[PDB]
């Protein structure tokens, strides 16, 4: 099979920057195609036959190449360009796709807004307590959440999830969920999530007293 290696695997670009990603094939091909896929959506044909744009694809995109080496360029990146881009060859059977280049958009640093949610009484009834900390609209993606219960640092009992980059403001959001038994939850008073981030000069703590 023709193997298609895409580079870089991940790219981060400021709006207005020219960037180029590459698809290198294990043997010669022609008329490479490219697809854009945003998180949670189906791929869309983006460039085909090496350099032709699909309907509705902005003119800042272009494609070129020859031999075993093909490229996709964005002449001036926009926030809406964040996506994974895949190349695809149809020179030999079977058709194969590249490994993808993921494009992230840079923006100015933004510290998270932090919110906390106690478990609902309804969930408690059933024997489990989920406490949720929300970090909203921050950049860059890296952040740190610590849970403290009556000032005791928690480990092993939380899980985090992070959204993909927002196509409009280029920020991320993150949720951290602390899971406890009812019986354990009703043992303690103060529940706190402590958040740090590149853009915070000291930790932000949101907390509540059960009751």
């Amino acid at each position: 099979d023709i193997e298609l290696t895409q580079s870089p695997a991940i790219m981060s670009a400021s709006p207005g920057e020219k960037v180029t990603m590459t698809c290198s094939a294990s043997s010669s091909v022609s008329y490479m195609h490219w697809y854009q896929q945003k998180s949670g959506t189906s791929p869309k044909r983006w460039i085909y036959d090496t350099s032709k744009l699909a309907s509705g694809v902005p003119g800042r995109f272009s494609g070129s190449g020859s031999g075993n080496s093909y490229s996709l360029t964005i002449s001036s990146v926009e926030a809406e360009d964040d996506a994974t881009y895949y190349c695809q060859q149809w020179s030999k059977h079977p058709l194969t796709f590249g490994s993808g280049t993921k494009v992230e958009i840079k923006r100015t640093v933004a510290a998270p807004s932090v919110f906390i949610f106690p478990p609902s009484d309804e969930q408690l009834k059933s024997g489990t307590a989920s406490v949720v900390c929300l970090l909203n609209n921050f950049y860059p993606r890296e952040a740190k959440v610590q849970w403290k219960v009556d000032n005791a640092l928690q480990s092993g009992n939380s899980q985090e999830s992070v959204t993909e980059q927002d196509s409009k403001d280029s920020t991320y959001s993150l949720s951290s969920t602390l899971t406890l038994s009812k019986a354990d939850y009703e043992k303690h008073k103060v529940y706190a999530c402590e958040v740090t981030h590149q853009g915070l000069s000291s930790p932000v703590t949101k907390s509540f007293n059960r009751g």
């Binding site: 195609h33 697809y35 079977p94 919110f115 949720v132």
Partner: protein, 220 residues
């Protein structure tokens, strides 16, 4: 306009089979090819094979011969793929995509059909409020949400107020819990002043368990 409507998410036991469909509309079915593509772990794309609807002939990636069987029903302009002898490695999202006889690539793709292969049974989610409070308020903005807990398999979709509320919504990717079940949350930021007057309902769809849940989320 060209539309490719695929069938919904599936759960199947190892060893079983599943037939998925792609209903094509807005164009002449037999003038184009129909391709099928597997996407694993939301990343790698593999071409399974194609069928030329005019005569039902098909061509396969040898890796998928005998795993996949392609057919069409020209009456209803529908393409089908049967996946046989399912194993965990077959858990993925499967796309149909229109191709041409003129080197146009895949110009339109279907919505995708998630298939999960597991011996575990389906389970619909419990939905709990993430209620707005003074501890989820900041400078006239309040956050609220719903916690969608303990369902299987993926996926769940969430909307707010039947799709009329979209600005400021964040629905998080699910996490797999130690129990083998998924959970996610969906949150939205809204003006604090609206809390007394505006109704907020999260609408949670879990097709694999044939369940939909609406949950009204209120202060306190």
């Amino acid at each position: 306009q060209v539309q490719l409507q695929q069938s919904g998410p599936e759960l199947e036991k190892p060893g079983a089979s599943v037939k998925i469909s792609c209903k094509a509309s807005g164009y002449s079915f037999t003038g184009y090819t129909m391709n099928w593509v597997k996407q694993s772990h939301g990343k790698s794309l593999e071409w399974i094979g194609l069928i030329t609807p005019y005569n039902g002939a098909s061509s396969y990636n040898q890796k998928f011969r005998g795993k996949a069987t392609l057919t069409v029903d020209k009456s209803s302009s529908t393409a089908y793929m049967d996946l046989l002898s399912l194993t965990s490695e077959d858990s993925a999202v499967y796309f149909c995509a229109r191709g041409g006889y003129d080197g146009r690539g895949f110009d339109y793709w279907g919505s995708g059909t998630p298939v999960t292969v597991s011996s575990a049974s389906t389970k619909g989610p419990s939905v709990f409020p993430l209620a707005p409070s003074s501890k989820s308020t900041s400078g006239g903005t309040a956050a609220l949400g719903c916690l969608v807990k303990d369902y299987f398999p993926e996926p769940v979709t969430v909307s707010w107020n039947s799709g009329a509320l979209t600005s400021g919504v964040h629905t998080f990717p699910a996490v797999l819990q130690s129990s083998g079940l998924y959970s996610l949350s969906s949150v939205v930021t809204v003006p604090s002043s609206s809390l007394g007057t505006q109704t907020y309902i999260c609408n949670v769809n879990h097709k694999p368990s044939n369940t939909k849940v609406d949950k009204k989320v209120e202060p306190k």
